[PDB]
Amino acid sequence: TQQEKEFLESYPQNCPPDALPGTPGNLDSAQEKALAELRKLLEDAGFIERLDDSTLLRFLRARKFDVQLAKEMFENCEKWRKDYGTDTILQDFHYDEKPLIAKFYPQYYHKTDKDGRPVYFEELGAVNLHEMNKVTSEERMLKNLVWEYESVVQYRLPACSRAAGHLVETSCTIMDLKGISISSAYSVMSYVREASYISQNYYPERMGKFYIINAPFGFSTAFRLFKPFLDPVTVSKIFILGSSYQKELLKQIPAENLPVKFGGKSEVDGLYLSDIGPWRDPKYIGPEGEAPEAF
Numbered sequence: 524t525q526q527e528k529e530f531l532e533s534y535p536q537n538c539p540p541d542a543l544p545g546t547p548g549n550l551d552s553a554q555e556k557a558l559a560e561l562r563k564l565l566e567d568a569g570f571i572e573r574l575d576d577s578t579l580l581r582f583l584r585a586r587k588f589d590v591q592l593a594k595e596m597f598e599n600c601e602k603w604r605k606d607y608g609t610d611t612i613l614q615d616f617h618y619d620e621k622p623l624i625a626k627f628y629p630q631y632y633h634k635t636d637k638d639g640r641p642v643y644f645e646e647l648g649a650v651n652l653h654e655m656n657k658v659t660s661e662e663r664m665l666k667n668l669v670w671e672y673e674s675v676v677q678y679r680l681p682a683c684s685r686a687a688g689h690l691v692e693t694s695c696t697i698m699d700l701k702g703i704s705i706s707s708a709y710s711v712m713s714y715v716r717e718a719s720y721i722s723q724n725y726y727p728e729r730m731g732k733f734y735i736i737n738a739p740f741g742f743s744t745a746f747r748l749f750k751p752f753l754d755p756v757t758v759s760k761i762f763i764l765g766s767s768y769q770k771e772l773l774k775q776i777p778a779e780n781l782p783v784k785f786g787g788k789s790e791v792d793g794l795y796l797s798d799i800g801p802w803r804d805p806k807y808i809g810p811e812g813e814a815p816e817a818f
């Protein structure tokens with residue numbers, strides 16, 4: 524508890540006043556009641572860690588401030604952390620195949636958006652699950668997903684909060700669909716389903732913006748039709764862009780931070796194996812120390 528309090532005291536803990544309702548620093552009276560109620564229930568259930576305001580408010584927002592439902596969601600997450608070995612994944616799991624997977628499925632963080640969010644990139648055009656599964660498995664790619672989430676939560680986001688001057692809880696996602704077929708997209712359905720189960724249930728409220736660029740015609744048409752089924756708050760985070768996406772990305776990410784290939788000015792001597800951002804700058808690294816490197 525003491526080292527956790529020392530960790531949280533070392534970076535800004537209030538969201539900007541523009542932020543969504545139910546976020547740290549932006550609670551109304553019923554939300555502040557539910558937060559104290561959830562904390563009391565989880566302390567009685569024997570939990571010690573991850574009972575800070577920002578964590579509990581993420582589970583609350585994910586369950587619309589239904590305290591019993593947020594309590595169940597938190598407990599399921601803690602049970603999964605125990606069963607999956609999440610608390611030691613950065614020490615146990617070694618993604619030695621990363622340079623090989625990068626040839627088929629680049630996944631990488633690079634710098635920050637104008638709101639201070641770390642920017643996560645994925646490129647889908649070269650995906651070949653059968654070829655990838657000669658050097659990895661779906662189980663190991665999901666292990667890498669959790670490895671990256673733990674690096675995000677424990678190292679990237681605190682440093683990003685220091686660089687921004689306010690709490691940063693979320694990432695800006697850019698997914699490049701250039702070159703993918705509907706058949707290849709179908710082949711990664713299992714991975715998308717399993718990874719999204721982990722995101723939703725164990726990392727709630729960690730997605731800040733979600734850009735899909737180079738969207739094919741059928742895909743963007745389907746999304747625009749299906750959109751009413753989404754939460755309007757969720758809809759406001761998602762941007763489905765075609766071939767001309769550079770001006771829209773540059774509204775959200777400083778040109779200095781956006782990679783050249785996507786319309787920006789940022790260069791890397793390469794990019795697919797890099798992890799460049801404020802969490803690599805000693806000015807913004809706190810008592811947690813520097814993020815580990817997958818490579």
Ligand SMILES: C[C@@H]1OC(=O)[C@H]2C[C@H]3CCCC[C@H]3[C@H](/C=C/[C@H]3CCC[C@H](C)N3C)[C@@H]12
Pocket residue numbers: 643645668669671672675693694695696714715718719722729730731732
């Ligand atoms: C949706 C998530 O919300 C965010 O803001 C990103 C956080 C980041 C944390 C580190 C692990 C991956 C990656 C996440 C997931 C990206 C998904 C999108 C669907 C295709 C594939 C499953 N990738 C991993 C997205």
